[PDB]
Amino acid sequence: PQITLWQRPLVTIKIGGQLKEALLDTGADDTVLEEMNLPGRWKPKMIGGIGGFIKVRQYDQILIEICGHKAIGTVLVGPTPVNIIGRNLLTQIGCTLNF
């Protein structure tokens, strides 16, 4: 699809057997999801944003279906206020900015 930005660019994702909504975020290098139950090994990471830093769990080679497109990559899980799809996954679904 083409998505205009009069509203937040939210899409449906499927990850770890669960349905969620997430924001297509061109200002996010990485993908950060709210606390959820993901299987397997994970590594501690700290990421920074507007008001400081949060601790996240880093999960690698995670399958995510983003608006019906499959991608595999790193997902960070932790206290983000909203689910963010970052450029690590936006590049895999062929997402571009146009003006």
Ligand X SMILES: CC(C)CN(C[C@@H](O)[C@H](Cc1cccc(F)c1)NC(=O)O[C@H]1[C@H]2CO[C@H]3OC[C@@H]1[C@H]3C2)S(=O)(=O)c1ccc2nc(NC(C)C)oc2c1
- C-alpha distance from residue 96 to each of 21, 45, 89, 91 (Å): 20, 28, 12, 8
Each residue 65-94 as x (binds a copy of itself by CB under 8 A) or -, in order, gives: --x-x----------xxx-x--x--xx-xx
Indicate left, alpha or beta for 68 from its phi (over 0: left) and psi (-120 to 50: alpha). Answer: left
Residue 14 binds which entry of ligand X, a copy of itself, none, CB below 5-8 Å type-dependent: none
Q: Does 5 bind ligand X (CB under 6 A)?
A: no
Q: What CA–CA distance (Å, rounded) separates 15 from 18?
A: 5
Q: Coil, helix or strand for 25?
A: coil
The minimum distance between CB 3 and a copy of itself, in angstroms, equals 4
Q: Binding residues for a copy of itself, per CB under 8 A?
A: 1-6, 8-9, 23-29, 32, 47-54, 67, 69, 80-82, 84, 87, 90-91, 93-99
